[PDB]
Structure 1
């Protein structure tokens, strides 16, 4: 169906450790493909997926140059925000930025994004129209007015509807074997007696891609999400994801309960019985 390319950036000031930590990660859908970590030895943008290693060396030189420029912008920004908020040079502070683009099933532009946060709160973000800004407070209002003068939105919109979507399409073709593949969950169910009148049913979904999924327990075809423990979808570490959902039920009523699994890779949702 639809697809996305996303970059995530974190910068954390360290008056104690000198220069701020800076981490950047790039994702197409739920697959990481690049990283830069200022605390790592390489000081380069690094591949994290095999299909991006098809990129020539001008790619890696050029992304390394621009990610180091991103870092310097964020470093200057932490100092600007310290002033805007009248804070002292003592404490550690954090800036977080996310940007990227979505395309539809036709791979045509669908939406663009560019959001910025200071110390874990919304600071400023670009609206859906890619031409105006939502400033979260009075300090961000100054950034909005500055960026309006300099056509910062029109600079970002050119990238988000053009460069961003064309590189996503390129990556989706170059990595067609893995990025365009869906991996349906491997499923099984476990049963544990918690007392001789109650028992835990656990429904498992393993090795699936992308991360989006719905696991639901039903009794007699009626919802039990309220009664269900659902763990957060977690990475397996190999590019796939895991999740489980469990209900505690009366012993001898296990047969009323069904587990339902919906996922992109499943042409029809499946039902698990004990």
Structure 2
């Protein structure tokens, strides 16, 4: 199946002569597995999934040392950007980076990612070829030229095609059960008053993992897209997710409507209806 690893890094500058705060979070198959935060009492990369406990003291020491180097790289880069954009020092500014790889079932890199944002807007990104850069900005053209001179794309390509893929694979092996577990949604329909002679039916799906899900309503087996409200999928807070979809229906006609829930943890899609 189609596995991924990402590291999402953030540096935020602070008023006065204060140092930026730097946070780095790592994800395997979209679940946080390690985190570093410079606001911590003893900043270090720390496990965030129990299966990361397998790694020995050296792994953590080396990851931590890399984080500390990244922290300084972000500090200098922030300062550089203040220059490019003729911005006044001692403000609040953000620099973010996403990097990582998607792997195939044959364990080849399918796609590599290396991209940056300043103030939450695209700054510079490595193209899918892993060889050239897209810069979004006149300022980012300075970076691009600098990184064409230094051969930075090759450095990142080598990480994306080697270490990224190799370690992702190791992490998948180590988090054997955990990483591959799905939780199927439990679903139910609720019924609520609404305007004169109409009611709301709301189809709920709870306790599911991964986040990906599709909820549909039908009237006598015919689809409904017209007049369906649905919320953004949202965390329960225990690692699983929630979603609902509702339709407005004539009073008395609630049994004409059917909710269908599609999720990859299901042996097949759920069909349900209002059950008073």
Which range, TM-score by smaller chain?
A: over 0.9
TM-score (norm 2): 0.94
- Residue 109 of structure 1 corresponds to 109
Distance verdict in 2 for CA 1:197–1:24, change over 3 Å: same
Q: Is the 8 A contact 2:17 2:90 kept in 1?
A: no
Superposed displacement of residue 196, structure 1: 5.0
Q: From the superposition, tell whether residues 263 and 108 of structure 1 become closer, same or farther in structure 2 (CA, over 3 Å).
A: farther
The question of whether the paired residues in 2 share the 8 Å contact of 1:3 and 1:107 is answered with no
Q: Unpaired runs of 5+ in structure 2? A: none
SS at match of 1:227: coil
Distance change (3 Å), C-alpha of 1:16 and 1:219? farther
2: CA distance, partners of 1:129 / 1:196: 59
Residue 166 of structure 1 aligns to a residue in which SS?
Answer: helix
Shift of 1:4: 0.6
Number of aligned residue pairs: 274
Taking the TM superposition and a 5 Å limit, the aligned residue runs for 1:114-263 are 114-263=114-263
Shift of 1:30: 2.4
Written as runs of structure 1 = structure 2, the 5 A alignment for 1:72-91 is: 72-91=72-91
Q: TM-score by structure 1 length?
A: 0.95
Q: CA RMSD in A?
A: 1.5
Q: 1:36 to 1:198 in 2, by over 3 A?
A: same
Separation of aligned partners in 2, 1:64 and 1:21? 15
Please report how far the alpha carbon of residue 235 of structure 1 lies from its aligned counterpart in structure 2 after TM superposition.
1.7
Give ranges in structure 1 of 5+ residues lacking alignment.
none
The structural deviation recorded for 1:176 is: 0.9
Distance of 1:193 and 1:229 partners within structure 2:
16
Assess if the C-alpha contact under 8 Å between 1:2 and 1:107 holds in 2.
no
Change (3 A) 1:52 1:226: farther
Secondary structure of the corresponding residue to residue 153 of structure 1: helix
